[PDB]
Design a protein that fits this description.
Strand content of chain A: 15-25%
CATH architecture of the largest domain in chain A: 3-Layer(aba) Sandwich
Helix content of chain A: 25-40%
CATH class of the largest domain in chain A: Alpha Beta
Structural class of chain A: alpha/beta
Bound molecules: ligand TZD, calcium ion, magnesium ion
CATH topology of the largest domain in chain A: Rossmann fold
Strand order of the largest sheet of chain A: 2-1-3-4-6-5
Distance between the termini of chain A: 62 Å
Oligomer: part of a larger assembly
Chain lengths: ~525, ~525, ~525
Amino acid sequence: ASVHGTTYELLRRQGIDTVFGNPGANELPFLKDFPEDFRYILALQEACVVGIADGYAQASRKPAFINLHSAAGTGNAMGALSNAWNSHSPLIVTAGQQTRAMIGVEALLTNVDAANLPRPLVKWSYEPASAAEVPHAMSRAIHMASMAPQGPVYLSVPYDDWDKDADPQSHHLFDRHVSSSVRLNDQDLDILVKALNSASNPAIVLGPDVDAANANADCVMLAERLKAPVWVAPSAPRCPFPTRHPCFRGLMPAGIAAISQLLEGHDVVLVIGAPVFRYHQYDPGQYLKPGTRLISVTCDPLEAARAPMGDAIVADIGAMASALANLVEESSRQLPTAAPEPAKVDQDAGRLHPETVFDTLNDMAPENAIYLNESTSTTAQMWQRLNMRNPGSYYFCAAGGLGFALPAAIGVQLAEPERQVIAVIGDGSANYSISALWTAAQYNIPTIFVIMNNGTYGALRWFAGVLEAENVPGLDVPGIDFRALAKGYGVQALKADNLEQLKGSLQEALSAKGPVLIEVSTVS
Amino acid sequence: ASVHGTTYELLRRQGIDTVFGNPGANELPFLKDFPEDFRYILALQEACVVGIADGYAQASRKPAFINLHSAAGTGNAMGALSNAWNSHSPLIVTAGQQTRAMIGVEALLTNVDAANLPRPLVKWSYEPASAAEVPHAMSRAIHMASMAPQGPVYLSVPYDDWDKDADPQSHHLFDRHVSSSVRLNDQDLDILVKALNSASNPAIVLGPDVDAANANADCVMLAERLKAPVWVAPSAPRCPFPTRHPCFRGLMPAGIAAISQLLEGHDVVLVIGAPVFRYHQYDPGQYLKPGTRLISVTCDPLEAARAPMGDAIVADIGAMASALANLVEESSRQLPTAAPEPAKVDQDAGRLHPETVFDTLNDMAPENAIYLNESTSTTAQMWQRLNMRNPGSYYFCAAGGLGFALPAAIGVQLAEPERQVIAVIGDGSANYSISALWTAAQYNIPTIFVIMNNGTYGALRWFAGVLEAENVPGLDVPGIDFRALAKGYGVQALKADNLEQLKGSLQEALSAKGPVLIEVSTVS
Amino acid sequence: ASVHGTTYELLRRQGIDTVFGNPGANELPFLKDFPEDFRYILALQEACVVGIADGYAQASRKPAFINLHSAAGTGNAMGALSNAWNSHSPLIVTAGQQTRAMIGVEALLTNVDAANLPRPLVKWSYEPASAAEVPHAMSRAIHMASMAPQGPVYLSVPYDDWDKDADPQSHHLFDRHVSSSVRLNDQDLDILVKALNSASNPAIVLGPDVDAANANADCVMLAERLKAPVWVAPSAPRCPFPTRHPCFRGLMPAGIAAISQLLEGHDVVLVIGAPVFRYHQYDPGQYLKPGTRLISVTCDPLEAARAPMGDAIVADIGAMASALANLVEESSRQLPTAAPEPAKVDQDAGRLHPETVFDTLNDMAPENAIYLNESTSTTAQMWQRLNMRNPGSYYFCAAGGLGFALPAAIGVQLAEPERQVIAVIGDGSANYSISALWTAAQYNIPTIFVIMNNGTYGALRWFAGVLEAENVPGLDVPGIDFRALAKGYGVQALKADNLEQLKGSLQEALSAKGPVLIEVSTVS
Ligand SMILES: Cc1ncc(Cn2c(C)c(CCOP(=O)(O)OP(=O)(O)O)sc2=O)c(N)n1
Ligand SMILES: Cc1ncc(Cn2c(C)c(CCOP(=O)(O)OP(=O)(O)O)sc2=O)c(N)n1
Ligand SMILES: Cc1ncc(Cn2c(C)c(CCOP(=O)(O)OP(=O)(O)O)sc2=O)c(N)n1
Ligand SMILES: [Ca+2]
Ligand SMILES: [Ca+2]
Ligand SMILES: [Ca+2]
Ligand SMILES: [Ca+2]
Ligand SMILES: [Ca+2]
Ligand SMILES: [Ca+2]
Ligand SMILES: [Ca+2]
Ligand SMILES: [Ca+2]
Ligand SMILES: [Ca+2]
Ligand SMILES: [Mg+2]
C-alpha cells in the first residue's frame, strides 16, 4: 500500500470522513484519487476553512480534519487557531510541504521551520522525517487532538511522501482506541462529595467544556440535588445549561471584583469545565471574599495551574459531572426560583434596538435553534433574551477573535442539519471572514446570518469611553452593503430597517430552502 | 513625558507618519490622543492591513508601521507575513497585549507566549519587560526592520505601558542613524570587476532586491557595459529591469534543469539581488552546466548560505550595483538585440484570452502604470506583454501566498499617487483579501482592480495535469458576482464579457476619480 | 559517492580538518572510516568539547567543527554555547539523531524537536528532510557560522543518512566562496572620515570583534593618526589593543553612569567591534553627557539595533578598520602619553595577593604569551598588570558563563603552539569544566593552568556586599585539592603557598614539556 492509501484508511478507521480545505500545489498529491467515501468542503480563504471545521467539530463533539496550503495558508488560519485553542477544539490541521528534494534550497512554497509556524496555538506540531512515518504521525495527530484537554494539532507533509510505499506494520494504527475518560479516585471523590453535601449555600459555575462533553443534563441534576444557583463562567464560548431552568443565573461579569462580590456568601463554589476565570476588563479587588472556598474541575492542567485561588481536580468533564450528579445527596433546601424575563425595551418604528432583535429571534426561532454570537457590544443582552433549552445552542469566539461566527455557523449547520442555526454578527465582525458565505451557498447549508448594522465598532467605542480615551481613530465602518456582499457570494439577502420588516424577513428566512442573510439596521 | 508621547516622538523622528491598523481593546491606549501629524489607515481584516502596509513599504522603499489586535489579529495576518518575509519588506508589526496585571491569569485577549507567535516569519520578535523599555524596544524594531536584509519585525506591548512615565534618556533614541549601505572591499571588488571584464559571454540575473534598492538604472548601465543579456530570477516578486530594453530576456523558468540549460554557454553568470534560485516545479538536473561559473550578490546571509552553487558576496544591493556599474569596462562585443513582441492570440467576439487582456492593458495604460499580479495561471504571458520602463512597476506575492495583490495594490497606490495602479487578480485569488476594497473606497485610493474570471483555480488544474493527478476536489469556484462584491464595499464596478466591453470599461476606469473594479470573463 | 564521503570532502574543501567531539551511538556512522587527513580531539564532557573548539576557533580566526551526541550531549554544551554566541565564535555544532525509522516512536536517543534545542544560542539550527540533503545542509552550516556576524550553528543528522547515496550535484558545494568582507560606501565613508578629522577631542572604544578580525594594528594606526585615547569596551571577551601603547587607557567600567562620565568632554566617540555597551552592574544615569556624539561600527545588526544611543554602521570590522586607518588625517594634536604602571601591592611571606600573581606572570611569561581569565574577582587588576603587545593575547567568557577558560585554554594552545598559554582560573571556576584537563594530558597540549585558590566565590561575596545582602548561602567552596584533581587527569601539578614557591613553580611550568597546573594560595 502507498502512504496515501494507508493514511486515508487510518482516517476512515478513526471516524474521519470530511476534509475542510483550501487546496494548493503541495496538497494535490494528497487530494488526488480522493476517496469516494470522503467529502471535501471548500472554503475560499483559510480563516474560513478553519472556522467552518471548528464549528463542525464543536457541534459534532468529534475531531475535524483540515488541509491547508503550506506556510501562507497555515498563516491565513492562525487567528482561527487562536479561537480553537481557547475552545479546546479537536482540529487536525494538515499542510502540504515542498518535495523533500527542494526543501533545502527553499524553493517557492517551502514551509520553513514548519513545525514552529502555528506555535503557541497547537498542542502538538510536527513534520515527519520520512514518508513511511507519515501514517504514524497522522495517528499521533488524531490522538493528540482528541485526548483531554482537546485542541488543535499541526502536521506538515512533503508532497512526495504520498506516493511512497507505506510500512505494512502501519496497520496496527488503524483501530487504536485511546481514552482519557477519567475521574477522581473514589476516596478523594468521596471527600469532594462530602464537602458539597455539607455546604450551607453552594453555588455552581459552568464553562464551555461542560457543553463540549454534553455534561449539561448531569449538571442540571447536580444543581437540582444541591439546590444551587448556576452561573456561566465569563467570556463564555458555549452555553452549558438551560437558560430558563430555575437555578440559572446567567453570564458572570468578566471582572475580578465583580465575581468575588457575586460569590459573596456562598461557602462552596464548584466550578466545572471553565478556566478560573476568563476575566476581561480590569476590575481589581479580591479573587474571593472571606468565607468562600472554590473547587475547580477542569480537563486542562494549564487551567488548573494558573487559577489564582481554589483547589482543582484535573479530569474528564463528562465522567466527573456524571459521577457527582449521581453521588451527591438531595438537599432539603428550597430549589432556587427562576429569574424573571428581562425588560422589553421601548421600540419605535425606526432602527432596531438589539434587545428587540433578540426578543424577536426568541419569539420566532424553533426551540432547538442554535445561535452564534459575534455582535460584540450586545452579548449581555443576548444572554438574557434567548431561551436555550438544549445543549449545543450557543457559540462565541473563545479567544475573542473576530471572524469565527460566520464560518463556524456554517460548520455547526452542517453538523446539525435538523437544528436551525442563526448567527448574529455585527457589521464590523462580518467582514473578517465574509467569503465563508460562498461555502454556504455552494453546499446549500441553510444557515441564517443576521447582520447587526450600526455602522461602528460599538464595543470599542464603549471601551474607549470606559478609558475616557479620546481621539481614537478607526472606530467607524460606514458604507458596507451587506445585501450586495451576500449577492456576491450567492446567498439570498433581505433587509430589515424596522420591526415590521424584521419580522417579515425572519419569516421568509425561516422558511427558505437555502442560506439567508438579513441586514438589520440597528441603533447607533 | 509618557511612554505614549515618547514613542510617537521616536516614530516621527524616524520618518514614520502612518499607522496601518485594525483596532482592538489592547490597542486603544496606544491609539488614543492620536497625533494630528499621523494618519491612520483602517482595513477590515488583518491580512488586508498587512498587505496594504506591505505594498506601501515596498513602493515607498521605507518602513511601514502596523498595529494589530493581540494574538487573533496577529494570527489573521500571518499569511501576509509569509509574503513579507520573502520580499524583504520592512514592516514594523505591533500588537497590543493585556494589562500586565492580567497576563498571568490569561484573561481574555492575552497573547500567550507572544514573541513566539509570528515566528519564523519575522527577523526579530519581542515583548518588553517593563513600560519604560517600550521606546527602546520600538527603536530596536525600527532598525531591525530597516537594516539589510530588510524584513518584518514584531513587538507586543501591554496596554498599561503607554500611560507610564518614560525614561528621559530615551531621547537618545530619536535621531539614531543606522547604516547597512556597504559594499565589498576594494581589493576583492577589483578581483570581481576583473572577472566580469574577462568574461567572454557574461549573463546577468536580477532579483527583487534590485528594484527595492532602486538599483535598476545602475543595472541597465552594467548590462550595457558588459553587453550582457539580462534575465529576471524565477518566481519574481518585483521587476528589476526595463522590459523592452535590448538586453532584457524575460522571466526565468523556475526549474533546476531549465535554468542550467538557459545559462549554458555563459561563462560567468552574475546574479544580483535574488536567491539562487527560487525554483518552484520539480525539474531535476544540473544546477549549472560545465563551463558556467556563478557569482551572487545578495543582501541576505540566508540566501548566500543556501545557494547550491557559485560564489557569493553579502552586501547592500544599491551600493554594489552602483560600484559595479561604474567600475566595469565597456566591452567591444555587440549589444544584445531586443526581443520581438510576442504573438497576438486569435480573439473572437466572446470570452477574453488572458493574452488579449494584457495586450489591451499595455495599449491603454499610462507608461508609468504599476501592475500587480495575482492571476496565477497567466504570469508568463503577463511578463511578455507589459512594457514596464520604470522601477517599481510590478509586484507579485513573494511567497506565492494569495491575498497579497488586492490589498497591496491599495498600498502601492497610496505610495505612488501619480502612477496608476492596475491589479490583475484571478477570481480565486480575489476572495482571500476581498474586504480590502473597502479601504480603497473609504480613503478614495484610485486603484483599478481587473478580475480575471474563469471560474476555476486554473494554476492548480494545470499542476494537476502535470501530475496526471485525477479526481482532485476543490478546484472550481463558480458563482461569484464580483460586481456585487465591489458594490458591497463601495467600489465602482464594471463588467467586460468581450473585447469591446473590455476597452470601454478600461476607458471608463482610467478616467474615474475613485477605485474601479472590472470583472473580465476570461476563457476557461 | 555516499553522504559520508561527500560530507568529509566538503569539510576538507572548506578548510576543516579537526573534529572536536564526545562520541555516542548516533554519531558512530559519521565517525566510522574517519579520514586519515582529519584529527579527532576527544574531551570527556560536552561543555569541555565546545570550550576547546571555541578557543581553537577564536585563536585561529576560522570555523571549528564539533560532533556531539543527540539531545543530552547538545544539552551538556549549552552553557558553552551561551559564551560562543556572545563572542561571535564560528562553531559548527553537529549532533547525531536516531535512525529515521525510529524517530516517530521516540526511541531512546531521539533528539525530539531537535532544531529547537539550542535556540536562542545559535544563528541557524536545522535537521535535513532527507539523507541526500545532508551535504547541502552542512554547506549552509559552514557558511552561516562564518559570515559576519560570526556565531554558532547547529545541524542534527539521522544516523542512517551517512551511508546513503549522495546527489552528484553536491560537488558544486565544495569550492563555494562566500564573502561578507564589506565596508561603508565611499560617499558615506567620506562623511565619517570628515567627522573624525574635525573632532576636537576624539576617543576610541574597541571591542572583541577587532581582535577577531586581527584589526588591532589598523586600530593602532587609527589611534595614532587621530591622537586619540583608546579604551576597551566593558566586559571584554578579548584584547583589541597593545596594553602599553601610549594611547591605551584600559578596560571601561561596566556601568551606564561610569561610562558617560569617562567619555565626558570627548566630542566624538568612535566605537569599533563592540556592543554599545555590555554593561553589568546597575549604575543608572546618562548614556552620554551633553556634548558627546557616539558612532559605532559593528559587524552585528543586533548590536546596532539595541544600542541606546549613537549612530551605527553595520560592516566587517577588518575592512572598516583598514579603510579608516588609511583615510583619516594625521592630527597636529599631541599624542596621548602612556599610563604609568600600577602600584606594587605590599606582599608578606604568606598567601598571595592576586596583584602579586599578575605582576609575577608579567615578569616571567614570554612576550607572546596568551592569557585566559576566569578569576572573576580580579579582572580589573589583571587588565592593569599584563603587558599584552600582540593580538590574540586575552580571552574571557563572553557571556560571563563559567567553565570556558579551562577548556578554551587548551583549544587556544592547540591553535597557537608557539605561544605559551597561561589560564588564570579561580578555584570556583575551575570545577565547571575540570575534566578538560584530560584532553591537555592526552594530546600533550602544554597549557599552564594557574588556579587562584581563595576558598570562596569571591566576586559573589563582593556583589552581595554591594547589595548589603546578608545571609546568602552557597558562597564558599572549601576543601578542593587541585593538585589531586590534576593528578586524576594526568597533568603535572605544583603548589604555591607564597611568592618564593610561586616563582619556583612558574619557572618549572614554563620549562615543562607538557601541561602544568599550579595551585596558588591567594588571600581571602
Ligand atoms: C481579529 C480581531 N480583530 C480585531 C478585534 C477587535 N474588536 C473589534 C474590532 C470589535 C468591534 C466589532 O464590531 P461589530 O460591528 O461586529 O459589533 P459591535 O458594534 O456590537 O461592537 S470588538 C473587538 O474585540 C478582535 N477582537 N479580533
Ligand atoms: C493562501 C493561499 N492558499 C492557497 C494557495 C494555492 N493556490 C491557488 C488556490 C491557486 C489558484 C488561484 O486561482 P485564480 O483564479 O486566482 O487564478 P488562475 O485561475 O489564473 O490560477 S494558485 C495556488 O498557489 C496559495 N498559493 N495561497
Ligand atoms: C555557569 C555559571 N554559574 C554560575 C555563575 C556565577 N558566578 C560565580 C559562581 C562566580 C564566582 C567564581 O569564583 P572563582 O573562585 O572562580 O573566582 P573569584 O573568587 O575571583 O570570584 S562569578 C559569577 O558570575 C556563572 N557566572 N556561570
Ligand atoms: Ca417574547
Ligand atoms: Ca451530525
Ligand atoms: Ca457594529
Ligand atoms: Ca500593442
Ligand atoms: Ca509617496
Ligand atoms: Ca481563475
Ligand atoms: Ca614588573
Ligand atoms: Ca595554528
Ligand atoms: Ca575563589
Ligand atoms: Mg509561531
